[PDB]
Write a structure and sequence with these properties.
Layout: H1 8-11, E1 18-21, E2 30-33, H2 35-41, H3 45-48, H4 63-75, E3 79-86, E4 92-103, E5 109-119, H5 125-167, H6 171-195
Antiparallel strand pairs: 1-2, 1-5, 3-4, 4-5
This protein binds flavin mononucleotide (FMN) and magnesium ion (MG).
Residues 19, 21, 28, 52-54, 56-57, 66, 69-70, 73, 83, 85, 95, 97, 99, 112-114, 116 line the site of flavin mononucleotide (FMN).
PDB class: de novo protein
Keywords: light switching, DE novo protein
Assembly: monomeric
């Protein structure tokens, strides 16, 4: 899956509410969801994976706030908003939501990270600004962990290609691919140390 590197393994036990979406697939589906997200929303992983996150919206959701998310995704920018969402039971909650693109080493947007902080009320003022700093710091910790997981998945994918080329006696291909593997390994090791 698009989530096999996680991300799932790298991501889902982080005790934060988040999803990862893949904007390079139809309708930017959720490809990973944290265990905590499923408990918040009360949906199962199988109900959520492969669907767009908009299912959380309902009758009182501010459509102009939703458009600010829409525009940030289209523009590939971060955004922080607060909007009304509903659990599977129809329980209303306020979702203080932070989106940010996750880039690969070339700077291209590979995934979106979305971090939720649920509450009973629309927060403002110092309470809001603090909650925003929590979810931004959480998003940064997910971004680095997910980037490391994506380098590990790239290393596994190139080792498969190297073995295929070795089986086929494709030695110019082996040479090319082993140089790429050496750069991926260096990148992986560098980022591993930073977050160690
Ligand atoms: C990473 C990510 C997570 C999202 N999480 C939520 C969420 O928690 N609640 C929500 O109402 N929308 C969420 N969305 C927003 C919707 O998926 C969608 O982008 C929004 O409704 C605007 O597009 P639409 O007008 O086509 O629905 C998320 C989007 C992304 C990319
Ligand atoms: Mg979308």
């Amino acid at each position: 899956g698009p989530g096999s590197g996680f991300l799932a393994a790298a991501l889902e036990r982080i005790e934060k509410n988040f999803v990862i979406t893949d904007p390079r697939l139809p309708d930017n589906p959720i490809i990973f969801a944290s265990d905590s997200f499923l408990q918040l929303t009360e949906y199962s992983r199988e109900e959520i994976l492969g669907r767009n996150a908009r299912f959380l919206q309902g009758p009182e959701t501010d459509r102009a706030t939703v458009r600010k998310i829409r525009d940030a995704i289209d523009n590939q920018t971060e955004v922080t908003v607060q909007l009304i969402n509903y659990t599977k039971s129809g329980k209303k909650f306020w979702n203080l939501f932070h989106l940010q693109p996750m880039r690969d080493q070339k700077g291209d947007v590979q995934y979106f990270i979305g971090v939720q902080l649920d509450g009973t009320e629309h927060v403002r003022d110092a309470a809001e600004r603090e909650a925003v700093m929590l979810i931004k710091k959480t998003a940064e910790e997910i971004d680095l962990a997910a980037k490391l997981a994506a380098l590990k998945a790239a290393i596994e994918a190139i080792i498969k290609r190297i073995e295929e080329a070795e089986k086929n006696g494709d030695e110019d291909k082996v040479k090319e691919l082993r140089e790429k593997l050496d750069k991926l390994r260096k990148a992986y090791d560098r980022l591993e140390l930073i977050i160690r």
